[PDB]
Amino acid sequence: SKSTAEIRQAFLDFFHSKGHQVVASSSLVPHNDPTLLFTNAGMNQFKDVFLGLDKRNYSRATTSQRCVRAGGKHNDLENVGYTARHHTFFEMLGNFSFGDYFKLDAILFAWLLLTSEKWFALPKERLWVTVYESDDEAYEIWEKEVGIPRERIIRIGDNKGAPYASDNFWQMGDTGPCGPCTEIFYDHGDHIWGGPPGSPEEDGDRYIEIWNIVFMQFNRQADGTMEPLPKPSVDTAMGLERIAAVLQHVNSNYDIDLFRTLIQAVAKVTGATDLSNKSLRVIADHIRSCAFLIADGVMPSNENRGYVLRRIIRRAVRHGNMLGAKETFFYKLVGPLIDVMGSAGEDLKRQQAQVEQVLKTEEEQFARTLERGLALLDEELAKLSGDTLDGETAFRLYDTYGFPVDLTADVCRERNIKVDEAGFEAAMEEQRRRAREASG
Ligand SMILES: Nc1ncnc2c1ncn2[C@@H]1O[C@H](COS(=O)(=O)NC(=O)[C@@H](N)CO)[C@@H](O)[C@H]1O
Ligand SMILES: [Mg+2]
Known part of the structure; x- marks a missing residue:
């Protein structure tokens, strides 16, 4: 099978050929916000780029960021040991578009890397996807452009029962860039307890969230109001450990x-x-x-x-x-x-x-x-x-x-x-x- 180190390489390479600038992972200590306990996402070092405050010579990048979710808005500490998919320390394989490509290419890149016989090639029948309820573009892209079955494109509304407390609307933290997002799930199959997303037993470890693709649309300022970003952008993270579990044929x-x-x-x-x-x-x-x-x-x-x-x-x-x-x-x-x-x-x-x-x-x-x-x-x-x-x-x-x-x-x-x-x-x-x- 493909080893963890091989997978990280392939991912970075693949996005490099697609014109993505490979940037070094930042440290777990975030000097971009004092507000923030630890680096919890690959986009952290690019926060101000999405805002237009910080300017780069590349319009797309790709990183393998080390993250610790042990605190604040992203705290998975108590999950460690009870699920087969949660860590405090883990790596995010992510691609980023700053004012460049949006939904169509973002979804295409993800599908290509996961399904291509030439890359690393998951069974298509196993994959499931989720889209934000209001996101008609994303749905249509998966249905028409990619060719996913309607039965396997689950729409998720603000389902946590607050506006939008949604699995398909991702926010950075208390403030920062945010927007609707689509997620790719892998079925590890019938022996594990658990059902698809939006299903009673969605938490169970059978249908694992492998890749989140966030369409950065808005910025959360301070006050609750949500201003638009200067240029729509893309932020994705695939969990290195979780995809390695799939590729190495484990659960x-x-x-x-x-x-x-x-x-x-x-x-x-x-x-x-x-x-x-x-x-x-x-x-x-x-x-x-x-x-x-x-x-x-x-x-x-x-x-x-x-x-x-x-x-x-x-x-x-x-x-x-x-x-x-x-x-x-x-x-x-x-x-x-x-x-x-x-x-x-x-x-x-x-x-x-x-x-x-x-x-x-x-x-x-x-x-x-x-x-x-x-x-x-x-x-x-x-x-x-x-x-x-x-x-x-x-x-x-x-x-x-x-x-x-x-x-x-x-x-x-x-x-x-x-x-x-x-x-x-x-x-x-x-x-x-x-x-x-x-x-x-
Ligand atoms: N506690 C954790 N342990 C292991 N892997 C994780 C953990 N949290 C997230 N991941 C992996 O990292 C991916 C991205 O995390 S996410 O919060 O859902 N999405 C984001 O972080 C967005 N910022 C994408 O830029 C997830 O799909 C999952 O595969
Ligand atoms: Mg999630």
């Missing part, structure tokens, strides 16, 4: 080449006994986020981005501990991570030791309170009559043991236990008021 992103090997490296250093465990996937994912974030200059901390990183690190250590890790293990996964990435882990080779060091200190510190905190937790769980852990307990784990609220929640989740988040909030606010009183 889970965690069965693709680089995850097969990465999970084995996790089993080695944790003493894990079976390779089909939730925690192995979680750790394999988290090492990608943490290692790359640090390599891009994010130092673990208690403030802002550093804290999100710290949280992910600690959550990963917690899983390793559960698997039976006898000693510091997390930093040992940097090496194997560098191998299974190669071209894409460039910056990560430069600093390897700096990253291994940061990840080592971090785990070494959390381990100082980890197991004692887990005991505190287990005690309190037994005292529980109900399915909800009191907020005071959650606050104690945070205040004393350095357990981020979501980490505690992740532990309780595995036992069908909720954590009373209102109480945690109350306890947290009560300390801010004590700090405010004492300090004045």
Whole structure:
């Protein structure tokens, strides 16, 4: 089959022949907005280009952007380990048109790359597409120009039950370029639970969203009002891991080449006994986020981005501990991570030791309170009559043991236990008021 690295190459090449300028992936730290926690999409570095504020010598580009969706408007952290298609760290294979080609060529390029016997050649019967309800052009293009069956062109209205809370209307974040979009889904077939988009069981992992194609029409200014973009443009992202799963004839992103090997490296250093465990996937994912974030200059901390990183690190250590890790293990996964990435882990080779060091200190510190905190937790769980852990307990784990609220929640989740988040909030606010009183 085509390997992950081969797929990334083919994609960039294909769009290069179609006149797309290959641009280097930006860092996970976004200096284009301070507003933004981490790079969450390939279009981020081109945000101001779509607006017309930032000007380039190319009218189309193509990138393989590294993204972390662990925060803000794009937060997939809690999905990690429960689906076979979600990561914190993942790569977006995307093509961009700035004032150049619009819908017809955008859809044509996508179909060509996916279906062509000469490129990488998915079964046509398997593919499904979605369009925004109002998008008649897109529908007609798929139906007439491409030749897709009407039964497989699902229209999606503002179906999240707010104007337009739509899977087919994509917005950058709180502000920025946006517009209706069309998505390409692949059927991994009958054995997986799940139905097509717009269907009750649309969330299930059978029909996977491979490629989103956003027709950039509008800009969201500040206030809610939606001004038009100077020139209609195209923004697409195909998930490298998800398409690799299709091409490599697997169903889970965690069965693709680089995850097969990465999970084995996790089993080695944790003493894990079976390779089909939730925690192995979680750790394999988290090492990608943490290692790359640090390599891009994010130092673990208690403030802002550093804290999100710290949280992910600690959550990963917690899983390793559960698997039976006898000693510091997390930093040992940097090496194997560098191998299974190669071209894409460039910056990560430069600093390897700096990253291994940061990840080592971090785990070494959390381990100082980890197991004692887990005991505190287990005690309190037994005292529980109900399915909800009191907020005071959650606050104690945070205040004393350095357990981020979501980490505690992740532990309780595995036992069908909720954590009373209102109480945690109350306890947290009560300390801010004590700090405010004492300090004045
Ligand atoms: N958490 C995630 N883990 C793995 N892959 C993801 C994740 N989120 C998105 N992707 C992949 O990236 C693709 C694009 O993401 S998208 O939000 O739907 N669309 C966009 O980001 C638009 N900005 C396109 O420029 C998706 O189709 C999916 O294949
Ligand atoms: Mg989506």
